[PDB]
Amino acid sequence: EFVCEENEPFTCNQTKLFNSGNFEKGFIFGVASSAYQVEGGRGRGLNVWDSFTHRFPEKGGADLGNGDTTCDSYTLWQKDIDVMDELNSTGYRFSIAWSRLLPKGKRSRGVNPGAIKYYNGLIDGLVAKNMTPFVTLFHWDLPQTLQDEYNGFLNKTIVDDFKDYADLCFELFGDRVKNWITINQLYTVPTRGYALGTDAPGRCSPKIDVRCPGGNSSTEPYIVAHNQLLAHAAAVDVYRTKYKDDQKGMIGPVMITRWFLPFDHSQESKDATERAKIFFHGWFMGPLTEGKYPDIMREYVGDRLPEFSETEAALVKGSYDFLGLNYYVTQYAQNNQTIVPSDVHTALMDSRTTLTSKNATGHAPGPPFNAASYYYPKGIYYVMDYFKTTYGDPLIYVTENGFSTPGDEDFEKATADYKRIDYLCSHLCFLSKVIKEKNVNVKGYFAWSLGDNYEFCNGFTVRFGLSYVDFANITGDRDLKASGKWFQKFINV
Amino acid sequence: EFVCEENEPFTCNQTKLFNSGNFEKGFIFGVASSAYQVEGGRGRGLNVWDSFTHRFPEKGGADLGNGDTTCDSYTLWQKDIDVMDELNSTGYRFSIAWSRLLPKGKRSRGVNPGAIKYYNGLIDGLVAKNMTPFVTLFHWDLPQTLQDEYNGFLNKTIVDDFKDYADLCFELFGDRVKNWITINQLYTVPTRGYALGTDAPGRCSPKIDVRCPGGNSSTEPYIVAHNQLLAHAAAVDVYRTKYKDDQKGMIGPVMITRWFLPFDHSQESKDATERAKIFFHGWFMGPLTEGKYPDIMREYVGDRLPEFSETEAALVKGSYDFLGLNYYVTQYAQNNQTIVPSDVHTALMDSRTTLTSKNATGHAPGPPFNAASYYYPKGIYYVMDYFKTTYGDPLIYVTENGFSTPGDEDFEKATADYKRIDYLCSHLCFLSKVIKEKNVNVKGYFAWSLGDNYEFCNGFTVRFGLSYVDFANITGDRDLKASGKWFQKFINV
Ligand SMILES: *[C@@H]1O[C@H](CO)[C@@H](O[C@@H]2O[C@H](CO)[C@@H](O)[C@H](O)[C@H]2NC(C)=O)[C@H](O)[C@H]1NC(C)=O
Ligand SMILES: *[C@@H]1O[C@H](CO)[C@@H](O)[C@H](O)[C@H]1NC(C)=O
Ligand SMILES: *[C@@H]1O[C@H](CO)[C@@H](O)[C@H](O)[C@H]1NC(C)=O
Ligand SMILES: *[C@@H]1O[C@H](CO)[C@@H](O)[C@H](O)[C@H]1NC(C)=O
Ligand SMILES: *[C@@H]1O[C@H](CO)[C@@H](O)[C@H](O)[C@H]1NC(C)=O
Ligand SMILES: *[C@@H]1O[C@H](CO)[C@@H](O)[C@H](O)[C@H]1NC(C)=O
Ligand SMILES: *[C@@H]1O[C@H](CO)[C@@H](O)[C@H](O)[C@H]1NC(C)=O
Ligand SMILES: *[C@@H]1O[C@H](CO)[C@@H](O)[C@H](O)[C@H]1NC(C)=O
Ligand SMILES: *[C@@H]1O[C@H](CO)[C@@H](O)[C@H](O)[C@H]1NC(C)=O
Ligand SMILES: *[C@@H]1O[C@H](CO)[C@@H](O)[C@H](O)[C@H]1NC(C)=O
Ligand SMILES: *[C@@H]1O[C@H](CO)[C@@H](O)[C@H](O)[C@H]1NC(C)=O
Ligand SMILES: *[C@@H]1O[C@H](CO)[C@@H](O)[C@H](O)[C@H]1NC(C)=O
Ligand SMILES: *[C@@H]1O[C@H](CO)[C@@H](O)[C@H](O)[C@H]1NC(C)=O
Ligand SMILES: *[C@@H]1O[C@H](CO)[C@@H](O)[C@H](O)[C@H]1NC(C)=O
Ligand SMILES: *[C@@H]1O[C@H](CO)[C@@H](O)[C@H](O)[C@H]1NC(C)=O
Ligand SMILES: *[C@@H]1O[C@H](CO)[C@@H](O)[C@H](O)[C@H]1NC(C)=O
Ligand SMILES: [Ca+2]
């Protein structure tokens, strides 16, 4: 029995006391990436994130970076496998770019054969290395023409287009791909893309930001999330009834997870802490389980929250085989019953709560994570436990988990990412405890990311990768950082 | 009387004997640019050239450059006026970006107010500086969603969308803008964008280039050019019936002009030289004057050449008030009746001619222009005379004329662009001769370009501007090259 440390110093970076043997045999220790962050613009059509970044370069990052060239994994895909081979990664999570397979958006307008060859090459390369291909259908890279036609997910037309795109993917790669993920972080797009206007497509209220071409921020996020659920339900419907019969695989969505703590020792904070969990996670888990949003959210939002039809409710309910939970940090929750003017009101205010980084006394829950948050290693223990106890204990994979490091660090400092090692071992340490003590059904962990790449809304100012990628010499060998070496030795027996 | 020199050395760089007084008083000596090459990606939607450059970086230039930032005239628009003020330029030619005023392509989908403020600022700045606003409605920057919906100009739908977009421009800027241009270089888009696949949208035959997503190099160019005439006629139709009554302005198209010489002293070359002029110029000038395609083109192309309807023929005929001629170089023409396989045949081969840089004896017609051609100063004299005699009422504006300089030249070499001075004075020299001797109705000349910018299909490998723009320091002062100083002294007499 090992005592996991919650604050510095950390002894989990020693493989003598912390190794893969602390987890059950067959645990998936892997890495992850996103299509827009690695692939690039070559051989693919323009998507919504291209338009958002090009029109508002600051919104895509302070460095004004974009997903045009990044590390060019579309051309250097073999290099990613080489890094994984050195990492002994048994699995890998990547995204299929909709604007690559369907540059014109719709399947009827044509399919890019070069896209199929590229993805087949990567999948076959993983199979030759005996790596499990975790595939994300949608990673926020919606084709641009779809947004210019029916505003993307704001219209229900996207459900049919997403169905056809998913239907084509199963026919091409379903023979080898067995882990299908529909959408990554369902909560992110309606909140940061349709309420705050900080992500693509950039819709927000005029008072929230004049740069937004338009938006309401009080009705659009609920509409977009409602149509996303219908599209996600339709994709699961197609896969099980046509491809699961022969390919024998599972399909499941991925949710963003955060742990919540009371701001102080008051009952109002305790209710606000519970409300934060319900609104942040139950907003989708409720429909995923009972086919309807939580009653408290339904009461609070009222008519601004749409409702699923009888046909839709059956499809949405139980529309998952596994859950790709992603946990990064823990935040404190407090009560905020302040009435807000309509011009600046956002859907995030409907919970009547305020999320903070520090406690009432200014104490952090853990070591610093980024410029404006701190990571709480025990938070992942709570998140897995919360999902297991609140919902019928499902098959859970840690599809995304990582630590941000400043990009201005030189090669020696970036490779010596001992802080990244501390983040990963500690979170894995509490992950092992919750699997053992609480019997939580967690079988896979994917560190984010495989290598340094473009970060949404931040450009290249920070790095999440386990392997350093000198963007001045992207064709050069991508050496593994000290965190990468530790992860391989952690896997190695 | 000055003896115009056709080859080196050139004595036309002395304003003492060759100045603006050689032209009639009120002659417009100005500069020109295009939206995609100067404006940038900020505050505008994605167009077809964005997709072309992003998907095929090599096709957009060896340097892989694109129109994302270039000289950033959207942010530094005052700098362009300052350079023109230093040049004593009496006029200026610019383009209104369709993806800027209408980022979604269709007028019903919304109008960008920030675009209106930007264009009004430039127009108002020009008026305060006594600058003549020459506006090009379309400079090949078609909105991407329009191409992704109805294949751009390949469909007749483009006529209605272009009509509404042109109508909006007259309503906003027609109070001050009096020189409206519908399309720039009508011949270029069907040939280099739908036959060779070298320009946007990149449609070409599979054998011509596998990189092209698809196209027929023998049928698509004639269809696209047919719809351009319908779109061009519609834009003129709107201006005359609604705005010409009160605004009192002129609207006219712009065509690319080349002079042709026999390859050798044979009759077959002489026949081919006459055919080259008909196919290069008469393809549109014929319908613009007589309402029908040239008879020789109709016989040669046959069914692959479309025909105008009775309603369309009346609208297309006489759908111009002036003609913006652009002349750069002269090419030799020879006969070539070689039958080509259909899979590799291009529409350019329908003339049964071959265009060469040198004649049969290997002699160049003039001093070198670029890496693979030479400029013939007397060619502009022939073009004005040929257009005047073949097409009565020859109201002619020289909308584009310039000399390219290699980008690898350092700051000192680029500023000392005496080769550009030699090109400009000599072409202007023959321009004065044809105005007097041949009595051609030429009133304006626009040198290309105002400053160094992105070059289509070439990136930033070459420079056409009269003022040096250090692209590492785009916000820095844009000093005038020796050609810019000469041009000001040419006017300042
Ligand atoms: C006409 O062209 C000649 C040839 O370039 C110019 O003479 C150059 O002047 C610059 C600056 O005075 C010198 O650096 C060059 O060395 C000169 N050329 C040569 C070959 O020595 C002349 O200044 C130009 N004059 C006008 C009025 O444009
Ligand atoms: C663990 O971290 C400490 C922190 O400085 C470092 O010195 C040590 O080399 C690391 N060991 C391993 C095995 O990662
Ligand atoms: C595991 O990592 C080692 C370290 O380089 C490598 O040699 C080996 O090939 C890897 N094994 C697999 C199956 O990729
Ligand atoms: C959804 O699709 C079609 C597209 O033309 C349109 O008629 C309908 O009004 C759209 N609805 C919304 C809310 O945009
Ligand atoms: C401050 O944080 C600590 C742990 O980080 C927590 O125990 C304490 O309750 C917080 N302060 C208040 C007033 O709740
Ligand atoms: C409570 O909400 C209001 C408006 O939503 C906001 O201005 C205020 O800062 C919030 N309270 C705290 C402590 O952040
Ligand atoms: C959002 O829509 C509602 C419709 O009830 C309206 O009352 C509100 O003013 C809108 N928001 C903004 C910022 O206009
Ligand atoms: C870039 O990487 C390549 C790898 O093959 C190497 O040969 C080259 O020296 C590197 N150049 C620089 C400037 O780091
Ligand atoms: C452990 O590492 C060795 C190389 O040191 C490698 O050959 C072996 O395959 C690794 N173990 C597994 C299970 O891949
Ligand atoms: C002509 O250019 C010169 C630059 O030397 C400038 O000072 C002058 O004001 C200009 N004349 C105009 C714009 O009438
Ligand atoms: C445009 O082309 C498409 C076929 O891909 C179709 O919607 C339509 O028939 C065309 N437009 C018109 C006006 O016919
Ligand atoms: C080729 O051109 C040169 C000058 O440009 C001329 O002297 C020569 O006679 C020409 N030869 C032909 C047309 O065969
Ligand atoms: C004549 O045309 C054919 C096909 O376009 C080409 O292969 C041949 O080189 C041409 N002849 C000359 C002399 O260029
Ligand atoms: C182009 O179209 C013609 C007739 O429509 C056909 O004969 C030819 O094969 C086509 N070219 C290609 C490359 O398909
Ligand atoms: C950029 O240009 C400005 C003005 O020309 C100048 O003051 C500055 O020193 C330049 N900086 C660099 C790094 O070239
Ligand atoms: C010559 O330059 C001066 C500079 O102020 C300018 O005012 C004038 O308009 C220019 N043209 C003539 C013909 O003087
Ligand atoms: Ca770009």
Q: Which atom of ligand 13 is nearest to the CA of B349?
A: 5
Cα distance from N-terminal residue to C-terminal residue, chain A: 19
How far is the C-alpha of B48 from the C-alpha of B61, rounded, in Å?
A: 16
Domain membership flag for residue A11: no
> Which H helix or E strand runs over A411?
helix A411-415
Give the domain CATH number at A346.
Answer: 3.20.20.80
Q: Identify the domain containing residue B367 by its residue range.
A: 20-491
Domain membership flag for residue A12: no
Q: Name the one residue in this structure whose structure tokens are 């070069």.
A: A114
What is the best residue among B76, B469, B470, B473 to mutate for testing ligand 15's pocket, by most ligand atoms within 8 Å of CB? B473
Distances, alpha carbon A96 to alpha carbons A44, A89, B402, in Å: 11, 20, 46
Cβ contacts below 8 Å, chain A against chain B, sum to 71
Q: Name the one residue in this structure whose structure tokens are 């956002």.
A: A346
Q: What is the CA radius of gyration of chain B?
A: 21
**Cβ(B204)–Cβ(B148) under 8 Å?**
no
**Cβ(A408)–Cβ(A335) under 8 Å?**
no
Distances, alpha carbon B119 to alpha carbons A229, A459, B135, in Å: 42, 30, 11
Domain membership flag for residue A357: yes
**Cβ(B135)–Cβ(B97) under 8 Å?**
no
Domain membership flag for residue A26: yes
Q: At what angle do helices A482-491 and A418-437 cross, to 10 degrees?
A: 30
B205 lines ligand 14 (CB under 6 A): yes
Beta bridge partners of B401: B447
DSSP notation for A92-112? EEEE--HHHH-TTSSGGG---
B236: tokens are 């003129």
Domain membership flag for residue A13: no
Torsion A171-A173-A177-A183 (CA) sign: negative
How far is the C-alpha of A195 from the C-alpha of A203, rounded, in Å?
A: 7
* Strands (E) located in A23-165: 28-32, 91-95, 132-138
A344: tokens are 């600046």
Q: Name the one residue in this structure whose structure tokens are 């400029």.
A: B375
This entry's atomic model was obtained through X-ray
How far is the C-alpha of A458 from the C-alpha of A53, rounded, in Å?
A: 11
Number of domains in chain A: 1
A476 lines ligand 8 (CB under 6 A): yes
How far is the C-alpha of A369 from the C-alpha of A260, rounded, in Å?
A: 16
Domain membership flag for residue A7: no
Distances, alpha carbon A246 to alpha carbons A9, A116, A119, A250, A320, in Å: 50, 21, 21, 12, 18
Interface of A with B (CB under 8 A): 41-46, 50-51, 54-57, 68, 103-105, 109-110, 112, 143-145, 148-149, 213-214
Phi–psi pair at A215, nearest 5 degrees? 160, 170
A4: tokens are 């996991």
Domain membership flag for residue B187: yes
Expressed in angstroms and rounded, the spacing between residue A241 Cα and the centre of ligand 15 is 64
Three-state DSSP class for residue B331: strand
Domain membership flag for residue A380: yes
**Cβ(A353)–Cβ(A283) under 8 Å?**
no
Asked if B43 lies within 8 A of A51 by C-beta distance, the reply is: no
CA distance B488 to chain A (A): 36
How far is the C-alpha of B194 from the C-alpha of B188, rounded, in Å?
A: 9
